[PDB]
Design a binder for this molecule. Structure first.
Ligand SMILES: C[C@@]1(NC(=O)C2CC2)CCS(=O)(=O)C1
Ligand SMILES: [Zn+2]
Ligand SMILES: [Zn+2]
Ligand SMILES: [Zn+2]
Length: 459
């Protein structure tokens, strides 16, 4: 059992207002046929247009909410809405486009999906709250058949062109008119009571209902993300490398070691309370400090309340020394903290839109993160960039321009002239730092933190 059997039953109650008389007894095999598609007993990689919840979770980067609302059915214009915010009007003859025939609408759909998905996934998964019109509109822009490869590269084909009779992936589909072998899932099959809005609004207040198809498309995908990444969590699912994952993760480790080491050297805290990932390792193994760990898994719904993490009777005295919250999202950090907090508003191919202001950050594993909130940092200040090193000044073993910087905290810079080794290491660190910030991470520190206290750690 890897794919969804076409012989699986499909509940049709949600479809009977657009499709009156629809049989209660229905399989995906009969539904696909009713949608105007012929599967021809083909064992060529595409067993079903519909996929399981587990297959959908593995392809969350491909998710595109899709809704169709009757503007006035083959006789009336249809409003096609996508979770990208696009509304297209198709005539049978928050962006809102005027009514156009299907032969031009389908070209826009291919362009939109290709621009949205080329850097995210090798496919598309239409996320539906199926009522009928969305399923019966698919024949006007979708073509199915055996799994194919792109005409210009090795990637799987996602588009088809009637002008050239060729197939393309999302990167090579300019001018293509059909979506080829898309996938889809109907959220209504998961067992819900009530309409889309009532279920969506239970968990999210950030997506309103402006009564347009793209609003329903957005709410549908948001509800699906809530069910699959908020109420249910699975950190055993791996996701392919699509960007700077490895550089970002390595940069995160370098910056954490740098910041914690310098905070310990500058303020000499006798104890450090490391709150977060139960599999955390000491980021500064040589530090003298008493290192105490507290287990908290990544919160995917609401940020942890500091009163629940710290209180109910451990060192007990979290007020002693410093608290390290490295990606441990809390409502309000104590004043004696070192914090790394992911900013959910960041635009990147790793960061997908999420539920109730939160975002779905996908880097090796999927992590739904509660909405970024500036008020969590009221007791702290932004951590300024700096590079600190106590290593000997020695080159060992890429051409040079001498480094001049007030933030290169080294013996050579104290002495008046940055050495080649510390200049190379400073530039590498600055690159790793900028990589982590641009990925969406934000750094915060206790107000007394001052890099001026680091200069006397070389004597
Ligand atoms: C003829 C069919 N396809 C087309 O319309 C091609 C794009 C022109 C109908 C739906 S199918 O089952 O994919 C075969
Ligand atoms: Zn290609
Ligand atoms: Zn929502
Ligand atoms: Zn040096």
């Amino acid at each position: 059992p890897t794919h969804l059997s076409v012989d699986t039953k499909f509940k049709t109650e949600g479809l009977c207002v657009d499709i009156p008389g629809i049989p209660k007894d229905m399989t995906y095999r009969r539904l696909i046929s009713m949608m105007g598609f012929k599967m021809n007993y083909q064992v060529n990689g595409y067993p079903n247009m519909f996929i399981t919840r587990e297959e959908a979770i593995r392809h969350v980067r491909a998710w595109i909410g899709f809704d169709v609302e009757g503007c006035h059915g083959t006789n009336l214009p249809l409003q096609l809405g996508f979770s990208t915010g696009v509304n297209l009007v198709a005539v049978p003859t928050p962006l809102m486009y005027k009514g156009l025939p299907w032969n031009v609408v389908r070209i826009k759909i291919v362009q939109m999906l290709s621009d949205t998905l080329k850097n995210l996934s090798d496919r598309v998964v239409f996320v539906l709250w199926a009522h009928g019109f969305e399923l019966t509109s698919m024949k006007y822009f979708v073509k199915i058949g055996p799994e194919r490869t792109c005409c210009l590269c090795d990637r799987r084909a996602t588009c088809f062109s009637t002008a050239s009779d060729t197939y393309a992936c999302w990167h090579h589909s300019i001018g293509f008119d059909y979506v080829y072998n898309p996938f889809m899932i109907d959220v209504q099959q998961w067992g819900f009571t009530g309409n889309l809005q009532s279920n969506h609004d239970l968990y999210c207040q950030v997506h309103g209902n402006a009564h347009v198809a793209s609003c329903d498309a957005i709410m549908t995908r948001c509800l699906a993300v809530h069910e699959c990444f908020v109420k249910r969590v699975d950190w055993t699912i791996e996701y392919p490398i699509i960007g700077d994952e490895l550089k970002i993760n390595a940069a995160c480790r370098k910056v954490q070691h740098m910041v914690v080491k310098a905070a310990l050297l500058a303020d000499k805290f006798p104890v450090l309370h490391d709150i977060g990932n139960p599999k955390a390792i000491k980021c500064v193994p040589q530090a003298d400090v008493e290192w105490k760990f507290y287990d908290a898994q990544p919160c995917s719904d609401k940020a942890y309340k500091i009163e629940e993490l710290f209180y109910s009777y451990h060192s007990d005295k979290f007020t002693d020394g410093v608290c390290l919250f490295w990606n441990c999202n809390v409502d309000r950090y104590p004043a004696n903290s070192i914090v790394c907090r992911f900013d959910t508003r960041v635009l990147s191919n790793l960061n997908l839109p999420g539920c109730d202001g939160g975002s779905l950050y996908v880097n090796k594993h999927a992590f739904h993160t509660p909405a970024f909130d500036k008020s969590a940092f009221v007791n702290l200040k932004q951590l300024p960039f700096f590079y600190y090193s106590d290593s000997p000044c020695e080159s060992h073993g890429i051409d040079y321009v001498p480094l001049k910087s007030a933030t290169c905290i080294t013996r050579c810079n104290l002495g008046g002239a940055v050495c080649r080794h510390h200049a190379n290491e400073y530039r590498l660190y600055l690159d790793a730092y900028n990589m982590m910030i641009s990925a969406g991470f934000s750094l915060w520190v206790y107000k007394q933190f001052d890099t001026y206290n680091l200069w006397n750690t070389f004597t």
